[PDB]
Design a protein around this ligand. Structure first.
Ligand SMILES: *[C@@H]1O[C@H](CO)[C@@H](O[C@@H]2O[C@H](CO)[C@@H](O)[C@H](O)[C@H]2NC(C)=O)[C@H](O)[C@H]1NC(C)=O
Lengths: 48, 48
């Protein structure tokens, strides 16, 4: 999935936020690694 | 210079304070926000 940079903190164990509490919530006992990286060029076009 | 607008003798609500204004930060210390509806406090103070 892709979300904005500001909400990257929200997608983590025991955190709040609109998308985390309404779209995708990580379990408290999660044992995995989360990776993030911008793709601005891919997310920018002439028509948006 | 801060103003303690003391609040007493009324019935509050907090769900309304979650969507109308998308607050930049919301850090509920000593108390998980979502549960603020179902307990009665003493002598609430507001600062600004
Ligand atoms: C301060 O701002 C809030 C929005 O954060 C205002 O709440 C809205 O008020 C109107 C009029 O009563 C309602 O139609 C809206 O439904 C409210 N917003 C939402 C999202 O529901 C509030 O009225 C403002 N307060 C003052 C005192 O000006």
């Amino acid at each position: 999935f892709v979300i904005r940079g500001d909400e990257v903190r929200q997608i983590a164990p025991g955190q709040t936020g609109k998308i985390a509490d309404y779209n995708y919530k990580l379990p408290d006992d999660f044992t995995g690694c989360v990776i993030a990286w911008n793709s601005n060029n891919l997310d920018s076009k002439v028509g948006g | 210079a801060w103003n303690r607008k003391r609040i007493s003798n009324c019935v509050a609500d907090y769900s309304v304070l979650y969507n109308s204004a998308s607050f930049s930060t919301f850090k509920c210390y000593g108390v998980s926000p979502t549960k603020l509806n179902d307990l009665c406090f003493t002598n609430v103070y507001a600062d600004s």
